[PDB]
Amino acid sequence: MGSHSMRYFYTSVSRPGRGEPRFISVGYVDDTQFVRFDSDAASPREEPRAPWIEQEGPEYWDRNTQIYKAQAQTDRESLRNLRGYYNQSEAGSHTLQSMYGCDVGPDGRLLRGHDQYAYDGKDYIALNEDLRSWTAADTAAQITQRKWEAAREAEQRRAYLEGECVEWLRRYLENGKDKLERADPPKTHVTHHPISDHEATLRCWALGFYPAEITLTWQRDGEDQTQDTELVETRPAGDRTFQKWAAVVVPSGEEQRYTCHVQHEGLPKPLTLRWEP
Amino acid sequence: TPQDLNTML
Amino acid sequence: MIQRTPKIQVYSRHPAENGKSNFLNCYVSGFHPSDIEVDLLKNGERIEKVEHSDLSFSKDWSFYLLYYTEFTPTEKDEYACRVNHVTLSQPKIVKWDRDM
Protein backbone atom coordinates (compact mmCIF):
# COMPACT_ATOMS: atom_id res chain seq x y z
CA MET A 1 0.00 0.00 0.00
CA GLY A 2 2.69 2.53 -1.26
CA SER A 3 5.03 0.77 1.11
CA HIS A 4 8.66 -0.33 0.64
CA SER A 5 11.21 -2.60 2.29
CA MET A 6 14.94 -3.04 2.61
CA ARG A 7 16.33 -6.46 3.51
CA TYR A 8 19.76 -8.08 3.94
CA PHE A 9 20.10 -11.85 3.65
CA TYR A 10 23.22 -13.50 5.14
CA THR A 11 24.27 -17.15 4.68
CA SER A 12 27.27 -18.66 6.56
CA VAL A 13 28.07 -22.26 5.78
CA SER A 14 30.71 -24.40 7.47
CA ARG A 15 32.67 -26.98 5.57
CA PRO A 16 35.00 -29.02 7.76
CA GLY A 17 38.11 -30.10 5.94
CA ARG A 18 37.47 -27.50 3.18
CA GLY A 19 38.42 -24.30 4.92
CA GLU A 20 36.73 -21.81 7.11
CA PRO A 21 33.02 -21.02 6.76
CA ARG A 22 31.83 -19.07 3.70
CA PHE A 23 29.85 -15.87 4.29
CA ILE A 24 27.59 -14.47 1.55
CA SER A 25 25.35 -11.38 1.82
CA VAL A 26 22.82 -9.96 -0.61
CA GLY A 27 20.84 -6.72 -0.12
CA TYR A 28 17.40 -5.93 -1.62
CA VAL A 29 15.08 -2.97 -1.93
CA ASP A 30 11.65 -4.52 -2.43
CA ASP A 31 12.21 -7.24 -5.08
CA THR A 32 15.40 -5.59 -6.57
CA GLN A 33 18.79 -6.86 -5.54
CA PHE A 34 21.31 -4.02 -5.25
CA VAL A 35 24.49 -5.29 -3.49
CA ARG A 36 26.40 -8.47 -2.76
CA PHE A 37 29.41 -9.66 -0.75
CA ASP A 38 31.11 -13.08 -0.94
CA SER A 39 33.99 -14.12 1.37
CA ASP A 40 35.18 -16.69 -1.26
CA ALA A 41 35.76 -14.01 -3.92
CA ALA A 42 39.25 -13.34 -4.99
CA SER A 43 39.39 -9.99 -3.10
CA PRO A 44 36.12 -9.77 -1.10
CA ARG A 45 34.33 -6.37 -1.42
CA GLU A 46 30.75 -5.15 -1.40
CA GLU A 47 29.80 -4.96 -5.10
CA PRO A 48 26.97 -3.10 -6.91
CA ARG A 49 24.17 -5.22 -8.41
CA ALA A 50 21.78 -2.45 -9.60
CA PRO A 51 22.60 0.58 -11.73
CA TRP A 52 21.29 3.17 -9.20
CA ILE A 53 23.74 2.21 -6.39
CA GLU A 54 26.80 2.69 -8.67
CA GLN A 55 26.88 6.38 -7.78
CA GLU A 56 27.75 5.81 -4.13
CA GLY A 57 31.32 6.96 -3.40
CA PRO A 58 34.42 4.90 -2.42
CA GLU A 59 33.71 5.56 1.28
CA TYR A 60 30.40 3.67 0.92
CA TRP A 61 31.99 0.51 -0.55
CA ASP A 62 34.96 0.67 1.86
CA ARG A 63 32.76 1.06 4.98
CA ASN A 64 30.37 -1.65 3.97
CA THR A 65 33.11 -4.11 3.05
CA GLN A 66 34.58 -3.73 6.56
CA ILE A 67 31.10 -4.35 8.08
CA TYR A 68 30.74 -7.62 6.14
CA LYS A 69 34.26 -8.81 6.99
CA ALA A 70 33.50 -8.23 10.67
CA GLN A 71 30.13 -9.92 10.42
CA ALA A 72 31.71 -12.94 8.72
CA GLN A 73 34.12 -13.29 11.66
CA THR A 74 31.24 -12.93 14.12
CA ASP A 75 29.28 -15.63 12.24
CA ARG A 76 32.31 -17.97 12.49
CA GLU A 77 32.26 -17.53 16.30
CA SER A 78 28.46 -18.05 16.26
CA LEU A 79 28.78 -21.29 14.28
CA ARG A 80 31.34 -22.63 16.83
CA ASN A 81 29.05 -21.71 19.70
CA LEU A 82 26.04 -23.30 18.02
CA ARG A 83 27.83 -26.62 17.55
CA GLY A 84 28.36 -26.62 21.31
CA TYR A 85 24.79 -25.61 22.16
CA TYR A 86 23.52 -28.65 20.19
CA ASN A 87 26.30 -31.06 21.28
CA GLN A 88 27.33 -31.56 17.62
CA SER A 89 30.58 -32.97 16.24
CA GLU A 90 33.22 -30.98 14.42
CA ALA A 91 32.67 -33.24 11.38
CA GLY A 92 29.41 -31.99 9.94
CA SER A 93 28.55 -28.91 7.79
CA HIS A 94 26.05 -26.41 9.27
CA THR A 95 24.33 -23.27 8.09
CA LEU A 96 23.60 -19.99 9.87
CA GLN A 97 21.18 -17.65 8.08
CA SER A 98 20.24 -14.08 9.10
CA MET A 99 17.52 -11.79 7.58
CA TYR A 100 16.91 -8.24 8.76
CA GLY A 101 15.56 -4.89 7.64
CA CYS A 102 12.76 -2.36 7.68
CA ASP A 103 9.42 -1.67 6.06
CA VAL A 104 8.30 1.91 5.48
CA GLY A 105 5.04 3.46 4.28
CA PRO A 106 4.55 6.08 1.48
CA ASP A 107 5.57 8.79 3.85
CA GLY A 108 8.88 7.12 4.69
CA ARG A 109 7.97 6.29 8.33
CA LEU A 110 8.83 2.95 9.93
CA LEU A 111 6.02 0.34 9.67
CA ARG A 112 7.90 -2.70 10.96
CA GLY A 113 11.45 -3.89 11.66
CA HIS A 114 12.83 -7.48 11.43
CA ASP A 115 16.00 -9.21 12.66
CA GLN A 116 15.96 -13.01 12.76
CA TYR A 117 18.02 -16.15 12.45
CA ALA A 118 17.86 -19.81 11.40
CA TYR A 119 20.25 -22.69 12.12
CA ASP A 120 20.27 -25.60 9.67
CA GLY A 121 17.15 -24.12 8.03
CA LYS A 122 15.09 -23.97 11.27
CA ASP A 123 14.03 -20.84 13.07
CA TYR A 124 16.49 -20.11 15.93
CA ILE A 125 15.87 -16.65 17.41
CA ALA A 126 13.96 -13.54 16.32
CA LEU A 127 13.68 -9.93 17.42
CA ASN A 128 10.06 -9.31 18.39
CA GLU A 129 7.97 -6.62 16.66
CA ASP A 130 8.46 -4.38 19.68
CA LEU A 131 12.24 -4.23 18.78
CA ARG A 132 12.87 -4.71 22.55
CA SER A 133 12.64 -8.48 23.19
CA TRP A 134 13.46 -11.78 21.64
CA THR A 135 11.67 -15.07 20.86
CA ALA A 136 13.84 -18.15 21.21
CA ALA A 137 12.85 -21.41 19.44
CA ASP A 138 14.51 -23.86 21.88
CA THR A 139 16.78 -24.17 24.90
CA ALA A 140 19.93 -23.50 22.76
CA ALA A 141 18.47 -20.22 21.54
CA GLN A 142 17.57 -19.34 25.14
CA ILE A 143 21.37 -19.19 25.69
CA THR A 144 21.77 -16.61 22.93
CA GLN A 145 18.71 -14.80 24.39
CA ARG A 146 20.24 -14.61 27.88
CA LYS A 147 23.56 -13.29 26.40
CA TRP A 148 21.82 -10.69 24.29
CA GLU A 149 19.53 -9.60 27.22
CA ALA A 150 22.69 -9.10 29.31
CA ALA A 151 24.33 -7.11 26.49
CA ARG A 152 21.17 -5.03 25.73
CA GLU A 153 21.63 -6.20 22.16
CA ALA A 154 18.02 -5.34 21.10
CA GLU A 155 18.67 -1.62 21.83
CA GLN A 156 21.39 -1.67 19.19
CA ARG A 157 19.30 -3.51 16.61
CA ARG A 158 16.42 -1.10 17.32
CA ALA A 159 18.65 1.92 16.79
CA TYR A 160 19.65 0.61 13.33
CA LEU A 161 16.17 -0.41 12.31
CA GLU A 162 14.50 2.93 13.28
CA GLY A 163 17.47 5.07 12.14
CA GLU A 164 20.00 4.04 9.52
CA CYS A 165 17.77 1.41 7.90
CA VAL A 166 14.95 3.87 7.24
CA GLU A 167 17.25 6.69 6.25
CA TRP A 168 19.26 4.61 3.72
CA LEU A 169 16.09 3.00 2.30
CA ARG A 170 14.65 6.54 1.72
CA ARG A 171 17.85 7.49 -0.08
CA TYR A 172 17.82 4.34 -2.28
CA LEU A 173 14.19 4.99 -3.22
CA GLU A 174 14.96 8.49 -4.33
CA ASN A 175 18.12 7.42 -6.29
CA GLY A 176 16.45 4.45 -7.96
CA LYS A 177 12.96 5.97 -8.27
CA ASP A 178 12.35 5.39 -11.93
CA LYS A 179 12.61 1.61 -11.28
CA LEU A 180 11.88 1.21 -7.60
CA GLU A 181 8.76 3.39 -7.46
CA ARG A 182 7.26 1.97 -10.74
CA ALA A 183 4.88 -1.00 -10.79
CA ASP A 184 4.86 -2.84 -14.12
CA PRO A 185 1.48 -4.62 -14.51
CA PRO A 186 1.28 -8.16 -15.82
CA LYS A 187 0.71 -8.79 -19.50
CA THR A 188 -1.92 -11.52 -19.44
CA HIS A 189 -3.37 -14.21 -21.69
CA VAL A 190 -5.15 -17.59 -21.59
CA THR A 191 -4.06 -20.65 -23.57
CA HIS A 192 -6.05 -23.80 -24.27
CA HIS A 193 -4.63 -27.30 -24.80
CA PRO A 194 -6.78 -30.40 -25.33
CA ILE A 195 -5.62 -33.30 -23.05
CA SER A 196 -8.15 -35.76 -24.52
CA ASP A 197 -11.50 -35.82 -26.30
CA HIS A 198 -13.16 -35.09 -22.94
CA GLU A 199 -10.83 -32.52 -21.23
CA ALA A 200 -8.63 -29.52 -21.90
CA THR A 201 -6.14 -27.44 -19.93
CA LEU A 202 -6.75 -23.70 -19.58
CA ARG A 203 -3.60 -21.85 -18.49
CA CYS A 204 -3.74 -18.26 -17.35
CA TRP A 205 -0.41 -16.38 -17.80
CA ALA A 206 1.01 -13.28 -16.17
CA LEU A 207 4.27 -11.98 -17.65
CA GLY A 208 6.50 -9.00 -17.27
CA PHE A 209 5.29 -7.77 -13.88
CA TYR A 210 7.02 -6.03 -10.95
CA PRO A 211 6.93 -6.32 -7.99
CA ALA A 212 6.58 -10.09 -7.59
CA GLU A 213 3.44 -10.19 -5.42
CA ILE A 214 0.46 -11.24 -7.54
CA THR A 215 -2.72 -13.27 -7.16
CA LEU A 216 -3.89 -15.51 -10.03
CA THR A 217 -7.04 -17.55 -9.52
CA TRP A 218 -9.46 -19.58 -11.62
CA GLN A 219 -13.23 -19.50 -11.03
CA ARG A 220 -15.79 -22.03 -12.33
CA ASP A 221 -19.29 -20.45 -12.39
CA GLY A 222 -17.80 -17.67 -10.19
CA GLU A 223 -16.54 -20.10 -7.56
CA ASP A 224 -12.80 -20.23 -6.76
CA GLN A 225 -11.19 -23.53 -7.74
CA THR A 226 -8.44 -23.62 -5.11
CA GLN A 227 -8.21 -27.38 -4.81
CA ASP A 228 -8.26 -27.93 -8.55
CA THR A 229 -5.79 -25.26 -9.70
CA GLU A 230 -2.15 -25.96 -10.56
CA LEU A 231 -0.06 -22.93 -9.67
CA VAL A 232 3.63 -22.49 -10.34
CA GLU A 233 5.89 -20.50 -8.01
CA THR A 234 6.34 -16.93 -9.14
CA ARG A 235 9.66 -16.95 -11.06
CA PRO A 236 12.18 -14.32 -12.20
CA ALA A 237 12.47 -13.57 -15.91
CA GLY A 238 16.05 -12.20 -15.56
CA ASP A 239 15.13 -8.62 -16.70
CA ARG A 240 13.92 -7.49 -13.21
CA THR A 241 10.35 -8.76 -13.95
CA PHE A 242 8.47 -11.88 -12.85
CA GLN A 243 6.25 -14.56 -14.38
CA LYS A 244 3.50 -16.85 -13.10
CA TRP A 245 0.78 -19.14 -14.45
CA ALA A 246 -2.23 -21.00 -13.10
CA ALA A 247 -3.93 -23.91 -14.86
CA VAL A 248 -7.10 -25.92 -14.58
CA VAL A 249 -8.27 -29.11 -16.36
CA VAL A 250 -11.81 -28.53 -17.61
CA PRO A 251 -14.50 -30.61 -19.39
CA SER A 252 -14.48 -30.01 -23.14
CA GLY A 253 -17.36 -27.75 -23.93
CA GLU A 254 -17.39 -25.99 -20.59
CA GLU A 255 -14.48 -23.56 -21.15
CA GLN A 256 -16.70 -20.53 -21.07
CA ARG A 257 -17.69 -21.28 -17.46
CA TYR A 258 -14.12 -20.52 -16.37
CA THR A 259 -12.63 -17.11 -15.64
CA CYS A 260 -9.01 -16.24 -14.72
CA HIS A 261 -8.74 -13.34 -12.09
CA VAL A 262 -5.57 -11.24 -11.84
CA GLN A 263 -4.68 -8.85 -8.98
CA HIS A 264 -1.50 -6.81 -9.01
CA GLU A 265 -0.39 -3.42 -7.61
CA GLY A 266 0.19 -2.17 -11.18
CA LEU A 267 -3.47 -2.85 -12.11
CA PRO A 268 -6.04 -0.08 -11.41
CA LYS A 269 -8.70 -2.79 -11.26
CA PRO A 270 -8.44 -6.58 -11.05
CA LEU A 271 -8.60 -8.28 -14.47
CA THR A 272 -11.01 -10.99 -15.50
CA LEU A 273 -9.88 -13.12 -18.53
CA ARG A 274 -11.55 -15.97 -20.49
CA TRP A 275 -10.30 -18.23 -23.22
CA GLU A 276 -10.88 -16.48 -26.57
CA PRO A 277 -10.94 -19.15 -29.35
CA THR B 1 23.69 0.01 4.22
CA PRO B 2 24.17 -3.08 6.39
CA GLN B 3 24.12 -3.07 10.19
CA ASP B 4 27.32 -2.97 12.24
CA LEU B 5 28.35 -4.01 15.80
CA ASN B 6 26.23 -7.20 16.10
CA THR B 7 27.47 -9.66 18.71
CA MET B 8 27.89 -13.41 18.38
CA LEU B 9 25.09 -15.90 19.12
CA MET C 1 14.13 -34.22 6.75
CA ILE C 2 16.34 -31.33 7.87
CA GLN C 3 16.96 -31.30 4.06
CA ARG C 4 14.63 -29.96 1.37
CA THR C 5 14.72 -31.02 -2.26
CA PRO C 6 14.79 -28.41 -5.05
CA LYS C 7 11.86 -27.27 -7.11
CA ILE C 8 12.88 -26.83 -10.74
CA GLN C 9 11.39 -24.65 -13.50
CA VAL C 10 12.78 -24.38 -17.03
CA TYR C 11 11.53 -21.54 -19.16
CA SER C 12 12.40 -18.65 -21.45
CA ARG C 13 12.66 -14.96 -20.59
CA HIS C 14 10.37 -13.98 -23.51
CA PRO C 15 7.81 -16.07 -25.39
CA ALA C 16 9.70 -18.45 -27.65
CA GLU C 17 9.90 -17.60 -31.38
CA ASN C 18 12.00 -19.94 -33.52
CA GLY C 19 15.10 -18.18 -34.81
CA LYS C 20 14.83 -15.24 -32.40
CA SER C 21 17.40 -14.66 -29.62
CA ASN C 22 16.15 -15.16 -26.08
CA PHE C 23 17.29 -16.39 -22.61
CA LEU C 24 16.90 -19.91 -21.27
CA ASN C 25 16.31 -19.94 -17.47
CA CYS C 26 16.50 -22.73 -14.92
CA TYR C 27 15.07 -21.54 -11.58
CA VAL C 28 15.89 -23.75 -8.64
CA SER C 29 14.16 -23.02 -5.36
CA GLY C 30 12.90 -24.43 -2.11
CA PHE C 31 16.09 -26.27 -1.28
CA HIS C 32 18.26 -26.73 1.84
CA PRO C 33 21.26 -26.98 2.32
CA SER C 34 22.65 -24.50 -0.19
CA ASP C 35 25.18 -26.57 -2.15
CA ILE C 36 23.70 -27.44 -5.56
CA GLU C 37 25.04 -28.07 -9.09
CA VAL C 38 23.16 -27.01 -12.20
CA ASP C 39 23.90 -27.56 -15.89
CA LEU C 40 21.91 -26.30 -18.85
CA LEU C 41 21.81 -28.76 -21.77
CA LYS C 42 21.33 -28.41 -25.53
CA ASN C 43 20.56 -31.78 -27.26
CA GLY C 44 21.95 -33.48 -24.13
CA GLU C 45 25.31 -31.57 -24.11
CA ARG C 46 26.36 -29.13 -21.42
CA ILE C 47 26.17 -25.45 -22.38
CA GLU C 48 29.45 -23.79 -21.23
CA LYS C 49 28.44 -20.18 -21.10
CA VAL C 50 26.01 -20.19 -18.15
CA GLU C 51 25.64 -17.59 -15.43
CA HIS C 52 23.77 -17.61 -12.18
CA SER C 53 22.34 -15.21 -9.62
CA ASP C 54 23.80 -14.52 -6.14
CA LEU C 55 22.60 -16.94 -3.44
CA SER C 56 19.44 -15.72 -1.64
CA PHE C 57 16.63 -17.32 0.28
CA SER C 58 12.93 -17.10 0.93
CA LYS C 59 10.94 -16.28 4.07
CA ASP C 60 10.93 -19.97 4.99
CA TRP C 61 14.79 -20.04 4.81
CA SER C 62 14.87 -22.14 1.62
CA PHE C 63 17.43 -21.13 -1.01
CA TYR C 64 16.86 -20.04 -4.58
CA LEU C 65 19.15 -19.47 -7.67
CA LEU C 66 18.50 -18.54 -11.29
CA TYR C 67 20.81 -20.10 -13.91
CA TYR C 68 20.60 -18.62 -17.39
CA THR C 69 22.13 -18.42 -20.84
CA GLU C 70 21.44 -16.72 -24.16
CA PHE C 71 19.94 -19.02 -26.76
CA THR C 72 18.13 -18.96 -30.05
CA PRO C 73 15.38 -21.55 -30.01
CA THR C 74 14.54 -23.63 -33.08
CA GLU C 75 11.88 -26.23 -33.97
CA LYS C 76 14.08 -29.23 -33.38
CA ASP C 77 16.70 -28.30 -30.70
CA GLU C 78 15.86 -29.71 -27.27
CA TYR C 79 16.86 -27.87 -24.05
CA ALA C 80 16.95 -29.04 -20.47
CA CYS C 81 18.22 -28.29 -16.96
CA ARG C 82 20.14 -30.94 -14.98
CA VAL C 83 20.27 -30.56 -11.14
CA ASN C 84 22.19 -32.34 -8.43
CA HIS C 85 21.65 -31.85 -4.69
CA VAL C 86 22.24 -34.00 -1.63
CA THR C 87 18.53 -34.92 -1.47
CA LEU C 88 18.74 -36.57 -4.93
CA SER C 89 19.88 -40.19 -5.54
CA GLN C 90 20.76 -39.16 -9.04
CA PRO C 91 20.67 -35.93 -10.97
CA LYS C 92 17.26 -34.70 -12.01
CA ILE C 93 16.66 -33.61 -15.64
CA VAL C 94 13.78 -31.29 -16.52
CA LYS C 95 13.15 -30.64 -20.21
CA TRP C 96 12.18 -27.17 -21.48
CA ASP C 97 8.54 -26.91 -22.63
CA ARG C 98 7.92 -23.56 -24.39
CA ASP C 99 4.31 -23.56 -23.05
CA MET C 100 5.28 -23.88 -19.37
Author numbering:
A (entry chain A): 0 to 276
B (entry chain C): 1 to 9
C (entry chain B): 0 to 99
Question: What does the literature reporting this entry say, word for word?
Answer:
The HLAI residues that are polymorphic are mainly those forming the peptide-binding groove, which contains six binding pockets (A to F) that define the size and chemical characteristics of the specific peptide repertoire that can be accommodated by each HLAI molecule. Cognate T-cell receptors (TCRs) expressed on CD8+ T-cells detect pathogen-derived peptides presented by HLAI molecules on the surface of infected cells. In this study we focus on two HIV-1-specific epitopes and their presentation by 4 different members of the HLA-B7 superfamily, HLA-B*07:02, HLA-B*42:01, HLA-B*42:02 and HLA-B*81:01. We show that single polymorphisms between different alleles of the HLA-B7 superfamily can induce a conformational switch in peptide conformation that is associated with differential HLAI-specific escape mutation and immune control.
To explore this notion, we first solved the atomic structures of HLA-B*07:02, HLA-B*42:01 and HLA-B*81:01 with TL9-p24. The total number of contacts, buried surface area and surface complementarities were comparable in TL9-p24 structures in complex with HLA-B*07:02, HLA-B*42:01 and HLA-B*81:01. Although peptide positions 1–4 and 8–9 were in similar orientations in both HLA-B*07:02-TL9, HLA-B*42:01-TL9 and HLA-B*81:01-TL9 structures, residues 5–7 in the HLA-B*81:01-TL9 structure, which differs in the peptide-presentation platform by just 4 and 3 residues compared to HLA-B*07:02 and HLA-B*42:01, respectively, were flipped into the opposite orientation. This ‘conformational switch’ resulted in Leu5 and Thr7 acting as secondary anchor residues in HLA-B*81:01-TL9, as opposed to being solvent exposed in HLA-B*07:02-TL9 and HLA-B*42:01-TL9 complexes. In contrast, the same residue served as a secondary anchor residue in HLA-B*07:02-TL9 and HLA-B*42:01-TL9. HLA-B*07:02 and HLA-B*42:01 have Trp at position 147, whereas HLA-B*81:01 has Leu147. Trp147, in HLA-B*07:02 and HLA-B*42:01, made three van der Waals (VdW) contacts with Thr7 and Met8 in the peptide, compared to just one VdW contact between Leu147 in HLA-B*81:01 and Met8, contributing to the respective peptide conformations. A second important difference occurred at HLAI residue 156 (with Arg, Asp and Leu at this position in HLA-B*07:02, HLA-B*42:01 and HLA-B*81:01 respectively) which contributed to the conformational differences observed at peptide residues Gln3, Asn6 and Thr7 (showing HLA-B*07:02 and HLA-B*81:01). Tyr9 in HLA-B*07:02, HLA-B*42:01 made direct contacts with the primary N-terminal anchor residue (Pro2) in the TL9-p24 peptide. Taken together, these data demonstrate that, from the perspective of the TCR, TL9-p24 ‘looks’ completely different in the context of HLA-B*81:01 than it does in the context of HLA-B*07:02 or HLA-B*42:01.
